Amino acid sequence: SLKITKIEIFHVHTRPQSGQRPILVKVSTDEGIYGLGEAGIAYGVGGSAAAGILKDYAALLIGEDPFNTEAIWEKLFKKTFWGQGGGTVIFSGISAFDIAFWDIKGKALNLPVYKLLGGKNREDLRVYASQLQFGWGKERKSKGRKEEYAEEALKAVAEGYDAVKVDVLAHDRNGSREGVFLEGPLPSETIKIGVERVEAIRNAVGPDVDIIVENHGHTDLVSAIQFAKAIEEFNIFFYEEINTPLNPRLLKEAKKKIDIPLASGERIYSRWGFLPFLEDRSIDVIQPDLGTCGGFTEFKKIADMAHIFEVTVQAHVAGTGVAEAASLHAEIAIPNFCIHEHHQKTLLPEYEELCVHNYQPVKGRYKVPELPGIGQDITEKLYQISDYVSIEA
């Protein structure tokens, strides 16, 4: 019965500490039910392109029935022209709408989204404390000294996390990115900086806390192999984004010389994006972002394909409470779940103020929301602190 009547797009003004700008969409229907979604380009450079694609796709969606998520997905894929060429922004547009549609379906049926995605596969979700190099962390500040890495890890363990993730190569010993270059064979001292940080954490947290190493795509396969050799002895849980994902075969080549499990996904989009990595079996833990991979509809398809290849899933989660709530539904509903990412940015007040619920882990575990829909909404403030665009018929 439902028809989309209004689409509102919020390109949120710069968040002071992080410098980031989340992009949210509110999709309203004739019956007054609305849904929230998020485009997963809150950080880096390109958020205005996400706000733009959402505006353009909106014209094709007014009048549509939000229950028709398969047909709408395929329409944005096949009828936009650019859908068939793919891309970060193209897929973020499809994703944000898809999330909002599933939010609507949940509300329309009086059920949490995970009940519409195939139910629960576990009672709760293991969580890791993500991006310790920026502090754990209501004050965001990049860390340079090895004792600071250990300290931030200890703060997370004190809160009950039994896993942490850290980028140990990005910053020099002053905590600056300035002059740090990580492609090709690395100097001994750069390797030493990474190793001393991993070692300081491992010593501090002991053997029963897992450590994930994040390279942020700053390395390439040559430097990634070199660094893995140096940190292997520390029992690394997995090794994330070790190069550029645009020539997929290179990760298979990296894996030939790296024994640590490999992870990637935040810059790989749709079934088509993940396919070559699965064919190569070069990724052990995939990390699709609901807000870029294609939404709930596509995340499920990616995870389901990945299961055939004995690959597990950790959703990439790095924006507002809309993104984070949504991720919990997607992860609880798949059998092949690894671990949940809990980003340090969620601990900053600039992010906390955006949503009505601040879902936080308890003793390092997350439970899925049990409200109808995704279980999240934006605050009334949002209109006033965003570039705002409204589309109707």
- By CB under 8 A, the residues from 17 to 76 that bind a copy of itself are 41, 43-53, 55-57, 59-60, 65, 67-71, 73-74
Residue of 113, 153, 170, 268 interacting with a copy of itself (CB under 8 A): 268
Q: Closest approach of Cβ 87 to Cl ion, in Å?
A: 2
Number of Cβ atoms within 10 Å of the Cβ of 174: 10
Tokens standing for residue 59? 């014209």
Residue of 17, 244, 358, 360 interacting with a copy of itself (CB under 8 A): 244
Number of Cβ atoms within 10 Å of the Cβ of 142: 17
End-to-end CA distance of the chain: 17
Report the site for a copy of itself in 202-221 (rule: CB under 8 A).
Answer: 207-208, 210, 217, 220-221
CB 40 within 8 A of CB 319: yes
How far, CA to CA in Å, does 28 sit from each of 97, 159, 202, 290?
11, 39, 49, 20
DSSP state of 61: T
Helix axes 295-308, 270-280, angle to 10 degrees: 10
Residue 80 interface partner, choices a copy of itself, Cl ion, none, CB cut-off 5-8 Å depending on type? a copy of itself
240 is in an annotated binding site: yes
Q: Closest approach of Cβ 166 to a copy of itself, in Å?
A: 17
Scan for tokens 């030493």, then name that residue. Answer: 192
Residue 301 interface partner, choices a copy of itself, Cl ion, none, CB cut-off 5-8 Å depending on type? a copy of itself
CB 166 within 8 A of CB 130: no
Q: Taking CB positions, which residue lies at the least distance from Cl ion?
A: 87
Residue of 151, 159, 172, 183 interacting with a copy of itself (CB under 8 A): 183
Residue 299 interface partner, choices a copy of itself, Cl ion, none, CB cut-off 5-8 Å depending on type? none
Report the site for a copy of itself in 100-129 (rule: CB under 8 A).
Answer: 109, 111, 115-121
Residue of 152, 284, 324, 377 interacting with a copy of itself (CB under 8 A): 284
Residue number with CB closer to a copy of itself (84 or 379): 84
Residue 145 interface partner, choices Cl ion, a copy of itself, none, CB cut-off 5-8 Å depending on type? none
Indicate whether 52 belongs to the interface with Cl ion (CB under 5 A): no
CB 383 within 8 A of CB 8: no
Residue of 32, 158, 188, 380 interacting with a copy of itself (CB under 8 A): 188
Residue of 79, 141, 363, 381 interacting with a copy of itself (CB under 8 A): 79
Helix H or strand E segment including 305:
helix 295-308
Helix H or strand E segment including 296:
helix 295-308
Indicate whether 46 belongs to the interface with Cl ion (CB under 5 A): no
String of contacts with Cl ion for each residue 73-92, x by CB under 5 A = --------------xxxx--
Indicate whether 84 belongs to the interface with a copy of itself (CB under 8 A): yes
- Which residues make Cβ contacts (< 8 Å) with residue 253, sequence separation at least 6? 221
- Which residues make Cβ contacts (< 8 Å) with residue 310, sequence separation at least 6? none
Map residue 20 onto helix, strand or coil: coil
Number of Cβ atoms within 10 Å of the Cβ of 84: 11
Number of Cβ atoms within 10 Å of the Cβ of 198: 22
Alpha carbons 175 and 12: distance in angstroms, whole number: 28
Indicate whether 195 belongs to the interface with a copy of itself (CB under 8 A): no
Report the site for Cl ion in 292-321 (rule: CB under 5 A).
Answer: none
Residue 245 interface partner, choices Cl ion, a copy of itself, none, CB cut-off 5-8 Å depending on type? a copy of itself
Which of 347, 355, 351 lies closest to 378 in space, CA to CA? Answer: 355
CB 342 within 8 A of CB 365: no
Residue number with CB closer to Cl ion (83 or 248): 83
8 is in an annotated binding site: no
Residue of 30, 147, 233, 279 interacting with a copy of itself (CB under 8 A): 279
Indicate whether 240 belongs to the interface with a copy of itself (CB under 8 A): no
Report the site for a copy of itself in 301-360 (rule: CB under 8 A).
Answer: 301, 304-305, 307-310, 312, 333-336, 338
CB 212 within 8 A of CB 235: no
> Which residues are known binding-site members for Mg(2+)?
214, 240, 266
Binding site for Cl ion (CB under 5 A): 87-90
